[PDB]
């Protein structure tokens, strides 16, 4: 989707919109529903949250977290245009992107548009974290210059 | 959860990091073991962290626990045959 | 026809039309493509043909190019450039005898420009054509040097030759630099329809050539007087010194209302006369997409302020009040076209009916009986607007899964459910539905509810084309009656149809009736023919592809609004996302109490050096003044004289201009009515490169209360205390783009 | 993620289930390379 | 139509006794502003003391 | 000792807005009272806007009627502008007829006992025929904000338009400097608001005052089944009237029904009215069925 | 008569030792009522079935009372006077008729009724097995344990209710 | 909070409708509109017995007025005091 701006994030969290996070996450939604046993078969989460009913909302909330999520500029040139983020739930259709993670991404906000990807297993979100994380890559790898200078 | 900063100061190659934590939370979270630190409701992810964090977990103790809690195992099966 | 059908079918230059802007189809069909059989290609070539050759000038526009893999292949054709009697191209210029500027215009080619030597477009002289310098810039052979005063052999014609029409609407062109006005002219071509389009306050005066020289408006043929204006038709009586001595005439104009454009947009037409109206030859009508009064508006024009305001729009972004959005003033109107074919496959054909399997109340209380839905039904995303199930196949019959499928005379039987369904995301209501059907096949009740309705409709229309035309006859019958024999009680005694036998000898008003009654036979047989064959086209089966039943097409009309996610720009290069819709009460306010509507950045004048949009904020503040100044003295109740006195002066206000209007003229109904026009606000023209300099926009500063810097202190809305060094305020007419976030998302 | 069709079924179970954890498998596409090289005269395998 | 939502303060996360941090939740759009104003200059600006 | 502001001088200057005057005031309550009510009664303040239009001939909002010079969409902004007071009533439907060459008014509406208009000469839309007539009617409600339509209809002639709930338009104060009352450095606060004569300007700042009043009101100054019958907080008699059938525990009284309960005459009057101030609670005596005892959540272990 | 009626009425599987004409006016009394869901005259859809032929008509009701609603099955007395006072207060006289309908859920929902009807067909066979040996002494088998009811299953498609009372 | 508090305590139908606008068409209105009423209170004051003893309303008037009946908002054999109810006041 399209980025914008939102400058209350701290540079480890991204905002990522309620219905781009529903449909990222619907199995560990079923997951979820199915452990605390609101319903039944699988079925029966797929219509939930088709009509996405009160109750998927806290089970969404309790899915985002601790997963972070890979950001990504659609040219991809160096290793810091693709960073992980912990999600923020954002009322709207925009990706709510950090500013000062900006300038590694070579992205102004003049129509851009940024691609999310889920790390799925666990090791997947350990990398994220431990490796991709924005806070991590605060250092151009190319010299000693900082890449979270502000712009 | 921010930062991994001492995650590394304790274990130095910071991929042995990524190892040492995701086999603690597979034993976390499939095999039904409890944390050694109190959560606030975190992921089994953070959770690791943090048990590498308090000094309580690596590799080395993993292994430990490991031999020790399959010689265990054994061990009752042997005096349940014997 | 297999050779001229490829070729105007598929075609490297028979290319798809993009219609979303009157100002997108007058400039996709004045298009030069290098591209195309015969010319280069993108990938392979080059530098040279990429870049602009000193003989572009007043021929293909230097700065309308898209931006990209393809920049000086895909340019666009200039203004005045018309196209030689062998195909190159010639732009007119004034043959400047030896002293005097003659106004004869002279239409020079590309080689014959470069052996003569041309005078600059704005050289200043003093009324007569003499040169007031002696010494004047001048182009000899490809090259700008400084000649001598008359050594000179041309002049061009008008300054806005070298440019464009896509970037000639842009004000304040010679103020920014090229690239930011490239992206400027682009953008331009890219906006989208509003729902109600307002005008640009600072425009450039091509705005009419645009709107009236494109087709989306409704330009009066012959002038006359307004008989019947309503939102479908138009009914222009045709002045006497106008019109033809036979068929009477009486003009009838149906407009075009809410239907599918190219791009989804909703190409609308508006009635912009009232009733009883005089109209001249040559004139608008009826208002299309993204016009008023025969103008051109794209976007719409909002308060602006450039101030950092806590980071919201930090590289780009645009932040927007929520008095935006409750004022329903980019709200766009868009319209999909969905489809539903009945194909012919095994088992036999498919079923359109709404007896449909796994379904229940919820999904069949929103279609009729016979499975499309209704005109009207506001749809959510992913209910059912047309109901099909094809043969699902008996393969395993079961006790009760073989049973009755003989006792049915419809062989189905359970079927397997492949209803068109909205698709997952997108509202609606139902506008208008389209059923074809392929000869042969029944027509269910809804195809014959159509076919009822269309009959009706053209039969109606039709029997009112004879009535109006009728009535334009006998009104021409009474015309001719006032001399020569005049009947004024015996006139309307006897049955309207027979006005040609009364006491009239041979002369040209016998003639007349007679040759009037030739056309009123004519209409007669003429409505006769028409109708059987109006009932037979609409009675008729159309040809259709190979193997269908019949295709129901269903017109949703969603209306978007505005989000953060948006892409707004203005004229200039100045793009965004809009980052944040803010509430009313935390816009940066002046010690009046309006609050601005949008706040930019101010730190992307300096590096992309488009000035040009301050002195358009500056030019439009100042346009605004001068309107609050007229609804101040409209308010108050005052008298035509005060508004006669205000609003000349606010028309003289200048140097050596060519407007010199003058409101003695107007007879004090017109000033009321154009008062009533000017109250938000007053529409600025400031051409190309002959603009409006800066102390005109200080001195039409002065004539409004406003400040002469542009600037006013601003409040916080907030805090409620003060922002420091006062900021710049003003009127920016800015353009929704239609590249929207949820079609992106 | 994106291509092993009998990994990513067990994915989608050990999601649903709480258990995080991939099987690897091959890519199938590998398997289309396998078929339009092994299509030509030439003799692509994988060995041990 | 009068009936808003009205907030009570959720929690006083106290550092050392001269220093605190009060939150207070929820408050109806764009009130957060109008009462952290309020307070912050009738706090900053006029309290009765001595010095 | 604080001096306290009391209004003192509306001037209704036109008949739209109004300037509304406070005094005294110490200094640093200028900017803050004012700052305060400007966003109070900017954010939330009681209109009376419109929700729904059925015109009579019209499907869709899309369409077009035929003898009026606007579309059906036009009316409906038209119709959103309209500036209407009602007074006793939550929501109320106003009727619209007129039939004749010219322009639709807001004076056409024909009137209720209580709504009231409060400018006559809104132009809606314009007829331009002999016999081409519209026939509405409006639904006009309270509200408080901006309610758009995709938020919140059922047959196919409704037509929602958006609702702008909001009174007022333009709020500005202006603090200037105080003279005698005998003592210096004291300011007063000149509200100039700007109404579309729906609310009453006195009563703008009367609600204003109350709801940011009522914002620092923060700050200012079954295991009834599972136990015993006996540990009731009701009297030992209230506990014996349902222990006479050999109950002891509240589930046993929860098996059974109260009808079944009142067909004995082991309970009394008073008992009833126990068991009534016990089943006001709801957690027992609700009319249910149990296996004998226990449910899932009781389990043994 | 698309003599397809008299093949998908004999599967018989699930259908014997029962009324088959009553079953057969059950499924009529069905396909009539969803007749009348689709209809406006908020009336009785009485299906009138023949044994001889086979094939059956559809009537409508008029159904005599002494009140108004129900208005396109509403009659009278002083309405009655018009047929001579020859109608009683509260009978079900029908005077109108309908015709048809086609739909393929039409028959879809005739042959889910008739599964049903069938199935009737599953359940009528139990009805009276209880009480074809009087009050016996019948042992059982609890198939499913509902809430406050034990359904058990005897043999030849037997079925049994234990009431927890 | 309590400055700021002292500191505000000095501020703080079927039947008024006519016969001809019934939904059936002009001779069901004018079978009643031929004993002087035009409105359908008038009716509703009026027995249907006494109604059916005048010859001024037809066999298809009065499947019209049960038609009309079939609502319950008129004809329901009540009594009025001459036109007005309660809710019907002057005012």
């Not at chain 3, 002289?125 to 040169?131: I, Q, R």
């Not at chain 3, 004022?327 to 969905?338: A, C, K, N, P, S």
Request: aromatic share 4%.
């Amino acid at each position: 989707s399209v980025i914008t701006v939102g400058p209350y994030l701290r540079l480890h969290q991204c905002g990522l919109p309620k219905k781009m996070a529903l449909e990222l996450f619907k199995p560990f939604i079923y997951g979820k529903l199915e452990l605390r046993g609101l319903a039944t078969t699988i079925k029966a989460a797929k219509k939930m949250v088709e009509r996405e009913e009160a109750v998927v909302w806290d089970i969404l909330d309790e899915v985002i977290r601790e997963h972070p999520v890979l950001l990504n500029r659609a040219p991809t040139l160096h290793r810091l245009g693709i960073q992980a983020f912990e999600p923020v739930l954002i009322e709207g259709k925009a990706i709510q992107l950090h500013p000062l993670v900006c300038a590694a991404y070579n992205a102004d906000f003049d129509g851009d548009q940024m691609a999310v990807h889920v790390p799925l297993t666990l090791e997947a979100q350990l990398e994220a974290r431990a490796l991709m994380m924005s806070t991590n890559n605060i250092l151009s790898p190319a010299n000693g210059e900082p890449i979270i200078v502000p712009s | 959860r921010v930062t991994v900063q001492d995650a590394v100061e304790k274990i130095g190659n910071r991929f042995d990091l990524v190892l040492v934590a995701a086999r603690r939370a597979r034993q976390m979270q499939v095999g039904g073991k409890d944390p050694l630190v109190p959560e606030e409701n975190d992921k089994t992810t953070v959770i690791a962290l943090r048990e590498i964090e308090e000094g309580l977990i690596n590799n080395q103790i993993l292994d430990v626990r490991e031999r020790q809690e399959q010689q265990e195992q054994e061990a009752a099966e042997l005096q349940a045959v014997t | 026809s297999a050779a001229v059908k490829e070729f105007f079918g598929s075609s490297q230059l028979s290319q798809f039309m993009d219609q979303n802007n009157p100002l997108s189809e007058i400039t996709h069909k004045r298009r030069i493509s290098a591209l195309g059989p015969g010319g280069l290609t993108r990938e392979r070539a080059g530098f040279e043909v990429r870049d602009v050759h000193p003989t572009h000038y007043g021929r293909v526009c230097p700065i309308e190019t898209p931006e990209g893999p393809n920049i000086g292949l895909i340019n666009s054709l200039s203004v005045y450039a018309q196209t030689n009697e062998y195909g190159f191209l010639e732009t007119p210029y004034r043959k400047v005898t030896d002293g005097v500027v003659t106004d004869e215009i002279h239409y020079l080619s590309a080689i014959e420009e470069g052996n003569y030597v041309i005078a600059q477009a704005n050289s200043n002289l003093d009324e007569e054509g003499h040169f007031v310098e002696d010494l004047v810039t001048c182009r000899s052979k490809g090259e700008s040097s400084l000649f001598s005063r008359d050594q000179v052999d041309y002049m061009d014609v008008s300054t806005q030759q070298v440019v464009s029409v896509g970037a000639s609407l842009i004000p304040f062109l010679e103020h920014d630099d090229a690239n930011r006005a490239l992206m400027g002219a682009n953008m331009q071509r890219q906006a989208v329809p509003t729902l109600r389009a307002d005008k640009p306050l600072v425009g450039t005066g091509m705005e009419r050539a645009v709107a009236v020289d494109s087709g989306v408006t409704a330009v009066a043929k012959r002038g006359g007087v307004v008989q019947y204006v309503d939102a479908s038709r138009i009914v222009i009586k045709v002045n006497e010194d106008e019109m033809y001595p036979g068929e009477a005439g009486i003009d009838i104009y149906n407009l075009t209302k809410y239907t599918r454009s190219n791009q989804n947009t909703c190409i609308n037409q508006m009635p912009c006369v009232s009733l009883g109206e005089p109209v001249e030859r040559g004139d608008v009508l009826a208002d299309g997409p993204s016009t008023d009064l025969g103008e051109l508006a794209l976007g719409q024009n909002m308060r602006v302020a450039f101030m950092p305001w806590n980071g919201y729009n930090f590289e780009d972004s645009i932040l927007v009040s929520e008095r935006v959005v409750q004022e329903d003033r980019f709200t766009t109107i868009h319209i999909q076209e969905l489809a539903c074919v009945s194909r012919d496959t095994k088992l036999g054909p498919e079923e359109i009916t709404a007896d449909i399997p796994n379904v229940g109340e919820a999904a069949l209380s929103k279609l009729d009986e016979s499975g499309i839905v209704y005109i009207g039904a506001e749809v959510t995303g992913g209910d059912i607007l047309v109901g099909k199930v094809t043969p699902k196949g008996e393969t395993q019959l079961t006790p009760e899964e073989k049973l009755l499928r003989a006792i049915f005379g419809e062989k189905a039987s359970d079927v397997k459910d492949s209803s068109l369904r909205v698709p997952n995301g997108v509202s609606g209501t139902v506008i208008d539905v389209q059923v074809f059907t392929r000869d042969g096949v029944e027509k269910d009740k809804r195809a014959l509810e159509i076919e009822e309705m269309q009959l009706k409709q053209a039969k109606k229309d039709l029997s009112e084309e004879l009535q109006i035309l009728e009535a334009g006859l006998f009104s021409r019958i009474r015309a001719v009656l006032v001399a020569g024999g005049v009947e004024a009680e015996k006139l309307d005694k006897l049955p309207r149809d027979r006005w040609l036998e009364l006491g009239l000898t041979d002369e040209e008003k016998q003639n007349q009736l007679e040759q009037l009654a030739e056309q009123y036979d004519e209409l007669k047989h003429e409505f006769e023919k028409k109708l059987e064959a109006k009932r037979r086209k609409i009675t008729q089966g159309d040809d259709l592809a190979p193997g269908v039943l019949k295709i129901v097409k269903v017109y949703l009309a969603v209306k978007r609004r505005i989000q953060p996610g948006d892409k707004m720009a203005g004229r200039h290069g100045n793009k965004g996302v809009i980052s944040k819709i803010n509430p009313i009460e935390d816009m940066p306010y002046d010690e009046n109490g309006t609050p601005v509507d949008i706040v930019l950045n101010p730190l992307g004048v300096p590096s992309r050096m488009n000035i040009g949009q301050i002195l358009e904020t500056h030019l439009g503040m100042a346009a605004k003044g001068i309107g609050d100044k007229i609804n101040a003295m409209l308010k108050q109740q005052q008298e035509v004289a005060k508004l006669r006195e205000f609003i000349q002066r606010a028309y003289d206000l200048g140097a050596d201009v060519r407007q010199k209007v003058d409101l003695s003229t107007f007879s004090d109904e017109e000033v009321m009515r154009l008062a009533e026009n000017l109250r938000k606000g007053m529409p600025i023209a400031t051409p190309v490169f002959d603009g409006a300099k800066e102390a005109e926009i200080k001195e039409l500063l002065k004539l409004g209360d406003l400040p002469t810097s542009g600037q006013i202190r601003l409040y916080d809305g907030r805090t409620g205390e003060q922002f420091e060094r006062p900021v710049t305020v003003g009127y920016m007419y800015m353009l929704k783009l239609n590249h929207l976030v949820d079609d992106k998302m | 993620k994106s291509d092993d069709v009998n990994g990513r079924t067990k994915m989608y179970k050990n999601i649903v289930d709480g258990n995080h954890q991939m099987e690897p498998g091959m890519p199938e596409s590998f398997n289309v390379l396998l078929k339009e090289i092994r299509s030509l005269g030439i003799n692509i395998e994988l060995e041990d | 139509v009068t009936e808003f939502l009205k907030p009570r303060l959720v929690d006083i996360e106290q550092v050392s006794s001269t220093h605190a941090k009060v939150t207070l939740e929820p408050l109806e759009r764009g009130f957060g502003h109008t009462l952290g104003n309020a307070l912050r200059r009738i706090l900053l600006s006029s309290m009765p003391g001595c010095a | 000792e604080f001096l306290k502001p009391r209004l003192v001088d509306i001037e209704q200057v036109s008949s739209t807005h109004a300037k509304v005057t406070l005094e005294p005031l110490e200094r640093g309550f200028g900017h803050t009272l004012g700052n305060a009510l400007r966003r109070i009664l900017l954010s939330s303040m009681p209109g009376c806007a419109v929700t729904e239009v059925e015109i009579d001939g019209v499907l869709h909002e899309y369409s077009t009627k035929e003898g009026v010079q606007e579309d059906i969409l036009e009316i409906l902004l038209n119709l959103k502008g309209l500036a209407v007071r009602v007074q006793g009533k939550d929501e109320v439907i106003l009727t619209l007829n007129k039939s004749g060459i010219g322009p639709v008014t807001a004076a056409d509406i024909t009137h209720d006992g209580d709504v009231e208009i409060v400018k006559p000469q809104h132009v809606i839309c314009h007829l331009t025929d002999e016999n081409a007539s519209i026939s509405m009617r409006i639904k006009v409600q309270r509200g408080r904000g901006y309610v758009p339509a995709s938020t919140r209809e059922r047959p196919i002639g409704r037509l929602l338009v958006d609702a702008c709930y909001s009174p007022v338009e333009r709020i500005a104060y202006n603090v200037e400097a105080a003279r005698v009352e005998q003592r210096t450095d004291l300011d007063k606060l000149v509200i100039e608001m700007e109404t579309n004569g729906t609310i009453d300007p006195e009563e703008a700042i009367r609600r204003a005052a109350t709801i940011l009043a009522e914002q620092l009101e923060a700050f200012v100054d079954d295991p009834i089944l599972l136990r015993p019958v006996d540990d009731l907080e009701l009297t030992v008699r209230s506990a014996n009237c349902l222990k006479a059938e050999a109950i002891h525990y509240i589930g046993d009284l929860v098996q059974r029904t109260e009808v079944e309960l009142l067909k004995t005459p082991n309970l009394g009057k008073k008992s009833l009215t126990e068991i009534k101030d016990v089943l006001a609670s709801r957690g027992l005596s609700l009319g249910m069925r149990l296996e004998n005892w226990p449910p899932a959540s009781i389990a043994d272990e | 008569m698309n003599k397809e009626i008299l093949a998908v009425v004999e599967a018989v599987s699930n259908e014997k030792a029962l009324p088959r004409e009553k079953i057969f006016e059950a499924l009529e009394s069905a396909l009539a009522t969803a007749t009348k869901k689709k209809y406006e005259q908020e009336i009785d859809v009485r299906v009138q079935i023949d044994r001889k032929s086979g094939d059956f008509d559809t009537f409508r009701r008029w159904l005599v009372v002494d009140e108004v609603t129900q208005p396109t099955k509403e009659i009278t007395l002083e309405a009655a006077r018009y047929e001579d006072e020859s109608l009683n207060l509260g009978d079900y006289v029908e005077d109108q008729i309908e015709s048809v309908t086609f739909d393929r859920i039409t028959t879809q929902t005739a042959k889910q009724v008739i599964v049903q009807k069938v199935r009737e067909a599953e359940r009528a066979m139990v009805v009276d097995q209880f009480r074809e040996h009087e009050g016996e002494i019948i042992t059982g088998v609890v198939k499913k344990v509902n809430r406050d009811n034990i359904s058990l299953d005897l043999g030849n498609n037997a079925e049994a209710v234990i009431l927890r009372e």
